[PDB]
Amino acid sequence: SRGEYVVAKLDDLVNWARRSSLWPMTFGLACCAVEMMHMAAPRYDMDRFGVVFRASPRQSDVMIVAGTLTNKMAPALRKVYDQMPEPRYVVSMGSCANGGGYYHYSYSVVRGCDRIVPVDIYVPGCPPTAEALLYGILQLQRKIKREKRLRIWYRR
Amino acid sequence: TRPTIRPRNDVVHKQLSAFGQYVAEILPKYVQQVQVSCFNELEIFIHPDGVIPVLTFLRDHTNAQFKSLADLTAVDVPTRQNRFEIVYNLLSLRFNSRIRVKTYTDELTPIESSVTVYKAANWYEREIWDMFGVFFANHPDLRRILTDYGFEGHPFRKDFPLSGYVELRYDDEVKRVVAEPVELAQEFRKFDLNSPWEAFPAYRQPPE
Amino acid sequence: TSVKPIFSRDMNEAKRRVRELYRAWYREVPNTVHLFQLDISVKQGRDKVREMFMKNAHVTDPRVVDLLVIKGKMELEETINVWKQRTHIMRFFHETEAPRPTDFLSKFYVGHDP
């Protein structure tokens, strides 16, 4: 009906803006963060897609957990994730952030950032190449494309 | 020409042996043993209380200007009575050489801090304490450096389990990270790799 | 003889050090509650400090006592400087641990634990 058409157009418009404008927080812990720099590098420019780093969590939408999440670091990661305002998305990058990585059986490593934060995308590798990270970002974008918040609300 | 085997340096071996005899003669009160490894690495084993005199001598002596502290670590050997083995690596730029000084201690016996001789010893001894439990007497600021805040136990001891005793996760009920006893999804699979046949007869221990 | 003591030599001075550390912790619970915005009471904090002190009441070796008070002083100085977060201070309380039964019948019911 007319209401369904209107809400479909509106939540396709809203998802388009979030998909086309991503502001990852400047947050990299370990060797996986170098591939973030190489994605920001001219070869695979991520600013081309509308993905630009921002420093403060308050002005960020995506947390790219790239590195090893230690016990001494987990509270800070949770705090910055909480301070990051909604809507927020999480991309775990590399084996350390995905599961345990090389340091899975260790006394001071958290096996998987998903134990601390809800992870939206998982990018495998050690480190995942810049192409792999860019593909993960594009997959996150396409995942945002199929969200229907207004369509769920209208039928709610 | 034996391309597989590493070459040897008799001249440097003799120089290191002469210097070891020299330092042993100069400091007989604390120096207990002097060894020269086959790859030309001088090694001195001294009494634990001689750390400050021996290090000050090796640092400020004219014939031994070891002004740079290369490293400072410890080795846990549970069988020995004094399990912890404090190791100092020193570099002499003037003579282009290196030396090693080894002392022994246990959990309760304190070792005099060498921060008054080398400043890197501050963080190196903080790491030694945080990892093994060896307490250094006169330290400007002794506390944990690598382990988590409030971490219990010393990880690098040979009696400490690899996975530790606790793990971390986020508990939504209390809206904060919580620490719970370790529970692995897949247990670490211990491998028995040692072969039952003796490899090097040169290191064979006598059957007494 | 010839055994190097960490501090305080005999047991009386070690007990004095223990009392000093207990006083220092006792005069810090209100500040810890105020700064960290803990939901616990000051009385609960003092009780927990007393419990953590009492769980080493069987120590009879002065060197072990000195090492224990050294570690306690390290933890005290970590709390004052707010190096710890609310997470660790509440880790002192085990607020999420499931109650493990200690009776033989219940332990037999649940699993193979001794």
Next chain:
Amino acid sequence: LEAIKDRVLYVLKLYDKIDPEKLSVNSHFMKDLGLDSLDQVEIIMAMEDEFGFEIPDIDAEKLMCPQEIVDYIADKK
């Protein structure tokens, strides 16, 4: 000295472990009241907060009785 004794008894009666009925000015904390060193330390700290001065550890050992406490407090004026 009556004011000091009244204040000390009032502070002691606020302690939960101490029974006001069995409390007396000449009651030994360790023997008559059956406490230990830590409870005595807490009591001495409470007295420090009460009368607004610092009692060192040496002076905190000679205060096993409320009479001794009030005598020490009057000694320091």
Next chain:
Amino acid sequence: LHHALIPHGKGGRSSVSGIVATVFGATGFLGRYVVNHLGRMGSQVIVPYRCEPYDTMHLRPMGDLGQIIFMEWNGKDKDSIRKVVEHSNVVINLVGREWETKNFDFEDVFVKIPHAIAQVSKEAGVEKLIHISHLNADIKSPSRYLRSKAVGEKEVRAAFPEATIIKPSDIFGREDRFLNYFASMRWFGGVPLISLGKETVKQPVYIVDVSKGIINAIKDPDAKGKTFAFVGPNRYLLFDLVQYIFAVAYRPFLPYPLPHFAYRWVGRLFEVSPFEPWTTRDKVERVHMSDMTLPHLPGLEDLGIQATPLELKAIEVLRRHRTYRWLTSEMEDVKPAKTVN
């Protein structure tokens, strides 16, 4: 028991508790707490969701790998209900909204959906059914909410004779309605109360206590077809309760008596919002209604849970509503409110 349902481990995150539970309406206050408790135990949890998958993200870290499974279901779709309850031996029913929408009403969300879930659960052969009702479930209550609650409770009992019906009094917590609703009246000047709130008696129950009671009801062998009433330890008059809430929040308290018809009109005005209403007429009726006393029903102390008093956990909720001036104030500063016992 099946070989895969035998309990194992020391009851940790990676253990096996032998519980496979489908938690309907888990994308809410009590739903999230119950799911967190089940995941902490180490159980298999199935979370049927009808909202956006983004709204169900906070449930992911509550369980280990392969423990939390998200499925899409429709309220009026018995096929979806069967799909989500086919392989679970415990079914937990927490579905309910405090307002009436265009598609779902109080009759739909409290009678039709719970009855359908109970009926399909019996067909699939689930061993345990837990159903959440309200303490003031009266067949002729002034509130259609409570009327439909009682009707649905009777229908669920008829459909699944081996059910456990929990009747909490009022949940207070971080994401609750109760304390937040009472403390959100700062904006509208004063605090309107019916007869100054001197005629209403309430004893709220802690969210963690309710969740632990639900969990222990599953593990309790002799609670198969029972009815429980979860209430707090202390009963408060509404006026004293609101006064204590505002004292803990450190906000000026200006209560005034508002007549019942005017309050009903105000609730009628606030329910026109297409989004979630701030308050409704039935919400006003529930607030005005006193908490019924049902001593014959078992409770938290009978299940094995000591009730948590309001004073201990009132600062977890109300500290957010303070200002920077009073943010650092401790819990002991505000004296406990007077009780009615």
Next chain:
Amino acid sequence: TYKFVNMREPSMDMKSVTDRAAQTLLWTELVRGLGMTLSYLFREPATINYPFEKGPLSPRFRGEHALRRYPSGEERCIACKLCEAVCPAQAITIEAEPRADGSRRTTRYDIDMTKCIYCGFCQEACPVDAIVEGPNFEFSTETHEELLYNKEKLLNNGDKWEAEIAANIQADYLYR
């Protein structure tokens, strides 16, 4: 040999003094930096048009894992557990038993891609070139569980990428 990076003292003749003063007043080096930036602006960008353009790779590239087959279709793995024993991260779990025809094959072969460090030791320790690190590197996921591969998943990956894997093995095996 050594060289002094910064030990050149400036001259003091009037010409050089005036030149330095002009540089201080008229921002000559700042204009030079501007000119360099402008030149880089007028150059050509070095950005590829991903995903329509893919960056160069090598036959030795180590990406997604796979299990290969002989041309007859039989599996290559013989459950020798060398990859399991040599895996630095212990990401491989292998359980075997005699098959119905007596062949030594695998019943369980699991690789935890969230634990693997992608180091290539498994493919170098394989005596029959069964386990390989294929060319695929774009296999990101929305859930953690799907990154725990098993025998069926690895065989499917090998069947899908068999041609490219065979070409890479042919191009590289002479260096091994």
